[PDB]
Amino acid sequence: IVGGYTCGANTVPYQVSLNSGYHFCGGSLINSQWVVSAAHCYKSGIQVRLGEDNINVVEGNEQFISASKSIVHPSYNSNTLNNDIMLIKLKSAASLNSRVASISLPTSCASAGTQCLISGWGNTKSSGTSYPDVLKCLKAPILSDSSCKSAYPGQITSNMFCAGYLEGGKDSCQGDSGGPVVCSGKLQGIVSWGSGCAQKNKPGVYTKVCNYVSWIKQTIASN
Numbered sequence: 001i002v003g004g005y006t007c008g009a010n011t012v013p014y015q016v017s018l019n020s021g022y023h024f025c026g027g028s029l030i031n032s033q034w035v036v037s038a039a040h041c042y043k044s045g046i047q048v049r050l051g052e053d054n055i056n057v058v059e060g061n062e063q064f065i066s067a068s069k070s071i072v073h074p075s076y077n078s079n080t081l082n083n084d085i086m087l088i089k090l091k092s093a094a095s096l097n098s099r100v101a102s103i104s105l106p107t108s109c110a111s112a113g114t115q116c117l118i119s120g121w122g123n124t125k126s127s128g129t130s131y132p133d134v135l136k137c138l139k140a141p142i143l144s145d146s147s148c149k150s151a152y153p154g155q156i157t158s159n160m161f162c163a164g165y166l167e168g169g170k171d172s173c174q175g176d177s178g179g180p181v182v183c184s185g186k187l188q189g190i191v192s193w194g195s196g197c198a199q200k201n202k203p204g205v206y207t208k209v210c211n212y213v214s215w216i217k218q219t220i221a222s223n
């Protein structure tokens with residue numbers, strides 16, 4: 001996260017870390033057995049880390065759980081990043097408490113201007129690379145579809161939204177992918193892609209979770 005602040009330990013109880021011997025993506029807990037993340041974070045060997053603040057120190061409150069399976073959206077397109085969503089089933093059910101809790105799915109899409117909380121352990125630099133130990137947070141509005149499309153003409157599908165600041169200085173960055181975008185208590189977005197980090201007129205692009213609620217529900221029911 002570039003331009004954000006320290007969240008505070010366990011204040012984003014639905015944030016997960018995907019680990020393969022290092023932190024490579026984020027994700028959100030949506031029930032005791034399932035995490036949502038981005039299709040592009042897809043790899044074998046994933047250990048889901050819940051209740052993490054400092055990802056380098058065991059502090060207490062962590063639960064380390066192997067993914068049992070990862071489900072990339074069948075229509076995911078790695079050139080376009082259209083349908084950039086993935087579900088991960090935990091080998092066993094997390095223990096839900098105040099530190100480790102699930103985020104609700106929206107029942108309707110958010111409008112332009114809604115303020116959301118984005119969070120991750122990704123690079124905190126616009127230029128160069130500086131990874132934090134602790135979770136960082138950012139408040140960012142959802143931009144209008146007109147602005148989003150005039151920033152990335154021919155690249156925005158109806159399953160993507162833009163959020164952030166046209167002025168540069170504040171954004172998600174390398175490391176943050178798969179992580180939540182939460183707006184009024186629901187998960188509206190997934191960190192997906194952009195152009196550099198916190199560059200002027202190049203806001204971050206997010207997966208539009210409201211378009212996937214049925215798919216999520218349907219796939220979880222059958223697995």
Ligand SMILES: [Ca+2]
Pocket residue numbers: 052053054055056057058059060062
């Ligand atoms: Ca830790």
